[PDB]
Design a protein around this ligand. Structure first.
Ligand SMILES: N=C(N)NCCCCNCCCN
Lengths: 278, 280
């Protein structure tokens, strides 16, 4: 009767009954574990926290990727910071306009373990590790340092494990300034912002820093299976991007299971007390 | 282990856990097991048959969406019926609408009401007054909501805040009952009930949706991140008459000073996983 629990501030806990432990490894950056749960497939755990559960991860990767993609007029060049499990790039590649996607992940072990034991990327990670993927380019490196030197991205998506905590790319206005400069015109930057209820102060702090840097900023939430849902997301745009509208026509073709492009307006649910604190 | 923990396990082996300071109570009533816990960070936790009913710190995330959308969509909710709601959260919210003239609360387990009034106390004195039949608008009745609805009618709004549809409680999600609930409604009138965990009690949701669709003039579904329950939670709405649930009276909503449900962005109240929408 094994049990996996992740505790959050104020003593809230996300728990899963698990069948067996499959793998426990230590990388130069973090502890990586893989469990076979009872009703959610395989769970990827990084330093004791849920990265994803194979039977539910689409509830995270879909709202993280598609909203931004569908709100950009021509998302040809995309940057993903993190995304070691491969889920985000998989969703990104579903968009035909994409010509090139650069993925910068600092921990190679997360990528290899995910490709061999998680397997949600469909072969994208392996094809990328050998540098044989047509559109995807993998760079084992630091995402922050990368956008300091690189530009030309229509869409920037941050999906990181946060090795040194959330602050690295959330409380850094330096970082947001570099991200905005890295975006094409028009461009869109999107990132997960943590738990709506248990990470509220941080969420609000990132929102205000982004507000001064980008041309317009937005927030949204989504019920993510595996996390202390609802989960918050933050968006920052450069130039002509109206995040309140998505090309629903293009959405129908993605075969989404969670995010509903036809009801994009419902993506913005957010407790009133929080909205009032902005 | 170093501390005390409380967990509600749902299907699929998923659990909602709370670190607690200690267990304040456990009373096996005629109908169910009632327990109260002092949590480390969410106030007092009320549980029935092991399922979370509410945490005093965050319960408005349930009672606000359960009550106000329907209340705000109705042109004039003068007479209201609540089935269940022993804790008093629902009636508290209902009484915030000045159009309300009288409310009838039908709860089957009186223990739940007494325990709530003594160890929870989120009802702002309402439960006590009704218990001694002194409330000016609220009237309490200890019985089965399923039977009361067979001989009673004349309600602008009907709020069903029962436990999960598992046992005697199950009948509050049956067609026979929906049919009578429909008949009991004025024209226009609106019915609303909690409908279970969106991701884990999906069948409860889908089953009730179809049953309600067969009975009412129009049916709607919505969800809200309820603190303490598997998140998000589903809600089903049944309408009789011209009421468009997609619209609520925003000006009236302002006077309520809500903390969770936002009537200014009523459209956001309808989030729902695409695959579940596609199963309707
Ligand atoms: N599995 C669960 N936790 N279900 C909770 C909903 C049933 C209690 N409704 C009454 C809530 C208090 N108004």
């Amino acid at each position: 009767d094994m049990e996996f629990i992740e505790w959050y501030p104020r003593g809230y806990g996300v728990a899963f009954k698990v069948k067996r432990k499959i793998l426990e490894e230590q990388s130069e950056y973090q502890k990586i574990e893989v469990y076979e749960t009872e009703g959610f497939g395989k769970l990827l755990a990084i330093d004791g926290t849920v990265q994803l559960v194979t039977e539910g991860e689409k509830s995270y990767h879909e709202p993280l990727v598609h909203p931004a993609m569908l709100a950009h007029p021509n998302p040809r060049r995309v940057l993903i910071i993190g995304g070691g499990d491969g889920g985000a790039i998989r969703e990104v590649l579903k968009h035909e306009e994409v010509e090139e996607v650069i993925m910068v992940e600092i921990d190679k072990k997360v990528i290899e373990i995910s490709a061999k034991y998680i397997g949600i990327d469909g072969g994208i990670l392996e094809k990328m590790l050998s540098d044989k993927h047509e559109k995807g380019k993998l760079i084992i490196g630091d995402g922050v340092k990368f956008i300091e030197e690189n530009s030309g991205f229509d869409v920037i998506i941050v999906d990181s494990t946060d090795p040194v905590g959330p602050a690295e790319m959330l409380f850094s206005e330096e970082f947001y300034k570099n991200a905005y400069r890295a975006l094409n015109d028009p461009g869109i930057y999107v990132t997960q912002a943590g738990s709506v209820y248990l990470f509220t102060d941080e969420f609000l702090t990132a929102y205000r820093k982004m507000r001064k840097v980008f041309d317009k900023v937005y927030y949204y939430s989504f019920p993510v299976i595996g996390y202390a849902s609802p989960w918050a997301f933050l968006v920052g745009v450069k130039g002509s991007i109206d995040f309140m509208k998505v090309d629903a026509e293009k959405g129908k073709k993605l075969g989404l299971e969670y995010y509903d492009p036809d009801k994009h307006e419902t993506l913005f649910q957010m407790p009133r007390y929080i909205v009032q604190m902005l």
